C-alpha cells in the first residue's frame, strides 16, 4: 500500500537540488517509507499539516530528529520546549511567548531597523559584497546577541553551535558525526551563557530568568530555556534573509515591485520563508497506531515531515515555484504549525522586514557577480556565499 523509496533526503546530492526529488516524494503517494533510514515520510502540504496539528499522536517528546529518545540518549539534554509535549510543553512555551511578545517587539524595533539601515549603507560603500557573510550573517549577529544580553567575548561560538544543533536533528551521517565531534567548546560556551549572572539586564535571557518568580518556570528551568534561544533563531533567520536577497537577485521584477511599495517588505520576507524554507524537515514519533492519508503507521515510528516540499506542493499553492511578494502566504509551514509553531517568529519577521525595507529604500539593483555556493546541513537550507553587486538608489 505504501511505496518504499531509496531517496536519501539527507544526502549532499539531495541538498544540492531537492526540488525534483521532492516532487517524486509528493507524487509517489501521501505517505512514503524511506528505506535508507527506516522512517515514514510525508511531503504533501495536507499530510504535513495534519501531522503538525496532532501533537498527541505525533509527539515531539521522543525527539524531533531521526533519533528516538526512547531508544537512544539525546546528544544533549532535551529542550524544555521543542522536545516536550503538552502539558509539560505548555508553561515554558508561555514564558517564551511572553519574552518574545508582540509588545516586546516594540522595545527592539527601532534599534533593529537602525542597524539594518546602517548595514545597507555600509555595503553600498563597498559595492560588491557577499550577501551571506556581509549581510545575511552580519546583520543578525549585529542585533540578536545584544538583544539576548550576551557579553561580547565568545560570540564566535554562536553560529557553530546553531549549525551543530540542526545537524544533530539528522541521521547519524558524516555531517552529524563531524558536528558532534567538534561540539565540546561551543557546548561549553552556550551552557555558561545561560546562567543568570551572564545575561545583561533587559535582554531576552534576563527576562526568561525573571519569569522564575511567577510559578510558570522554576529557577533551575531558566538556563535550559535560555539555551533554546541560543539554539534556534540565528541560522534560520540568516538563511531566511540570504534567501530573500537571493530571490530579489534572481527575480528583479519582484525587487522593482518591492522598491515601488516598501510596505511589502514583511510579506516579501514571508514569501522567502515559504520559497526556500530555511527549516527543511522535522520528525515526529507515533504514540499509537494511526491512519494517515489511507496509510497505517504503527506505534513508535518516526515520521519525517518535508516542510519545504509542503510549501511547494501544487495541490495547495498556485505557481509554487515562483517568488511572488504579494502572495497570500498565510498557511505556509516554514515556521511550523500548531502548538510548536515558531515562538520566535515575531523576532524573525522583524529582522527580515527591516532588512528588506532598508534594501527597498536604498538599493536600485542587486546583481549576482560571482559563483553561488550552497551551505550543507542536515536540517537547514541556505547559501554559503552569494556575491552580489549592489547599485545605490
Ligand atoms: C526565518 C526564521 C525561522 C524559521 C524558518 C524558524 C522555523 C521554526 C520551525 C519550523 C519550528 C517548528 C518546530 C516544530 O514544529 O517541531 C520552530 C520552532 C521554534 N523556534 Fe523558530 N524559526 C525561525 C526563527 C526563530 C527565531 C528568531 C527564534 C527565537 C528568537 C526561534 C525560536 C524557536 C523556538 C524556541 C521554537 C520551539 C517552539 C516550540 O516548540 O513551541 N525561531 N521554528
Ligand atoms: Cl548543548
CATH number for the domain including 366? 1.10.630.10
Domain count, the chain: 1
Main-chain dihedrals φ then ψ at residue 127, nearest 5 degrees: 90, -80
Contact 246, 174 (CB under 8 A): no
- The separation between the first and the last C-alpha atoms of the chain, rounded to the nearest angstrom, is 58
Contact 159, 242 (CB under 8 A): no
Angle at Cα 284 formed by Cα 279 and Cα 288, nearest 5°? 165
- Specify burial of residue 86 (Cβ count, 10 A radius: 0-12, 13-18, 19+): middle
Question: Measured from the CB, is residue 343 less than 6 Å from ligand 1?
Answer: yes
User: Residue 167 Cα, ligand 2 centroid: separation in angstroms?
Assistant: 13
194 marked ligand binding residue: no
Cβ atoms within 10 A of the Cβ of 253, count? 11
Question: Measured from the CB, is residue 60 less than 6 Å from ligand 1?
Answer: yes
Q: Which atom of ligand 1 is nearest to the CA of 307?
A: 10
User: Residue 300 Cα, ligand 2 centroid: separation in angstroms?
Assistant: 26
Question: Measured from the CB, is residue 99 less than 6 Å from ligand 1?
Answer: no
* Contacts with 365 (C-beta within 8 Å, 6 or more apart), sequence order: 252, 255, 389, 390, 391
Distance CA 389, CA 367 (A): 5
User: Which domain range does residue 210 map to?
Assistant: 4-392
Question: Measured from the CB, is residue 336 less than 6 Å from ligand 1?
Answer: yes
**Hey, what's the cell of 268?**
516579501
Element (H, E) at 307: helix 307-310
Method of determination? X-ray
DSSP-based three-state secondary structure for 391: strand
Q: Which residues pair with 116 in a beta bridge?
A: none
Nearest Cα residue to 391 out of 256, 267, 261, 266:
256
Amino acid at each position: 500500500t505504501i511505496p518504499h523509496l531509496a531517496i536519501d533526503p539527507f544526502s549532499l546530492d539531495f541538498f544540492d537540488d531537492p526540488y525534483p526529488d521532492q516532487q517524486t516524494l509528493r507524487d509517489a503517494g501521501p505517505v512514503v517509507y524511506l528505506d535508507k533510514w527506516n522512517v515514514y515520510g510525508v511531503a504533501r502540504y495536507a499530510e504535513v499539516h495534519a501531522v503538525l496539528n496532532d501533537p498527541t499522536t505525533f509527539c515531539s517528546s521522543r525527539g524531533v530528529g531521526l533519533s528516538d529518545f526512547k531508544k537512544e540518549k539525546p546528544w544533549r539534554p532535551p529542550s524544555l520546549i521543542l522536545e516536550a509535549d503538552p502539558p509539560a510543553h505548555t508553561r515554558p512555551r508561555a514564558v517564551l511567548s511572553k519574552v518574545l511578545s508582540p509588545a516586546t517587539m516594540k522595545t527592539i524595533r527601532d534599534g533593529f531597523a537602525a542597524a539594518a539601515d546602517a548595514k545597507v549603507d555600509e555595503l553600498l560603500q563597498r559595492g560588491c559584497i557577499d550577501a551571506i557573510a556581509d549581510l545575511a550573517e552580519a546583520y543578525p549577529l549585529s542585533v540578536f546577541p545584544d538583544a539576548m544580553g550576551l557579553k561580547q567575548e565568545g560570540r564566535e561560538h554562536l553560529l557553530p553551535y546553531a549549525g551543530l544543533v540542526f545537524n544533530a536533528f539528522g541521521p547519524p551521517n558524516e555531517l552529524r558525526q563531524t558536528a558532534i565531534e567538534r561540539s565540546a567548546p561551543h557546548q561549553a560556551y552556550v551552557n555558561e551563557q545561560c546562567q543568570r549572572p551572564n545575561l545583561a539586564p533587559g535582554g531576552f535571557g534576563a527576562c526568561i530568568h525573571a519569569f522564575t518568580d511567577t510559578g510558570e518556570i522554576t529557577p533551575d528551568e531558566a538556563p535550559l530555556l535560555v539555551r533554546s534561544l541560543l539554539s534556534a533563531g540565528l541560522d534560520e533567520t540568516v538563511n531566511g534573509i540570504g534567501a530573500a536577497v537571493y530571490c530579489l537577485a534572481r527575480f528583479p521584477g519582484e525587487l522593482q515591485r518591492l522598491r515601488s511599495d516598501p510596505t511589502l517588505a514583511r510579506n516579501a520576507f514571508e514569501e522567502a520563508v515559504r520559497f526556500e524554507s530555511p527549516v527543511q524537515t522535522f520528525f515526529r514519533t507515533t504514540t499509537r497506531e494511526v491512519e494517515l492519508g489511507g496509510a497505517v503507521i504503527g506505534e513508535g515510528e518516526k515520521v519525517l515531515m518535508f516542510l519545504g516540499s509542503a510549501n511547494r506542493d501544487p495541490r495547495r499553492w498556485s505557481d509554487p515555484d515562483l517568488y511572488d511578494i504579494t502572495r497570500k502566504t498565510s498557511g505556509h509551514v516554514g515556521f511550523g504549525s500548531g502548538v510548536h509553531m515558531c515562538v520566535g517568529q515575531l523576532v524573525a519577521r522583524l529582522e527580515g522586514e527591516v532588512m528588506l525595507s532598508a534594501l527597498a529604500r536604498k538599493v536600485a539593483a542587486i546583481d549576482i557577480d560571482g559563483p553561488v555556493k550552497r551551505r550543507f546541513n542536515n536540517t537547514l537550507r541556505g547559501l554559503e556565499s552569494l556575491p552580489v553587486k549592489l547599485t545605490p538608489a
